[PDB]
Amino acid sequence: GREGWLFGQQVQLHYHRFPDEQLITNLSRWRTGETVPSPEVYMKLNYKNPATISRFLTRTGHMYPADILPLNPEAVVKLRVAKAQAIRIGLYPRFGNPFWFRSQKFRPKAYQENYDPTTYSTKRTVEHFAYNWVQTDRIRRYFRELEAVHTSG
């Protein structure tokens, strides 16, 4: 059938968590030089970023207490003017928080009722090599095209 798909597709052992991560870890380990505020937050605390406003607000859209959410003293002023300027032109609702669940770091599972901190130390690197049924037919088609290119070529 096709021959470019065989030389284009590469067999992977694990795919990735997201396909850039090992390059990022290698360049970060070299960038630190070890032998083997945030720069984009204050730039995005404005009226045109409804998510960065909502990541410091509660579920009803109001302010958290200072002991619960402590912040930089200029970041709270940027947040308090960004919320008002986004509310004024209708880019933010006067009541509510449409990006609240996007910002919560501690989320429970779908089959759980609360978040437990024992899930943080999972580190499941697929020790038993679970192969999905959608990957097995791809592997079989790859090796069938490998045999097809071995028979003719």
Amino acid at 43: M
Query: What minimum distance in Å lies between the beta carbon of 144 and another protein?
Result: 13
Query: What minimum distance in Å lies between the beta carbon of 67 and another protein?
Result: 7
Phi, psi (degrees; rounded to nearest 5) at 128 = -105, 0
DSSP H helical segments within the chain, as ranges? 4-8, 21-31, 50-54, 73-88, 133-152
What residues form DSSP beta bridges with 57? Answer: 63
Query: What minimum distance in Å lies between the beta carbon of 54 and another protein?
Result: 10
d(CA 59, CA 99): 9
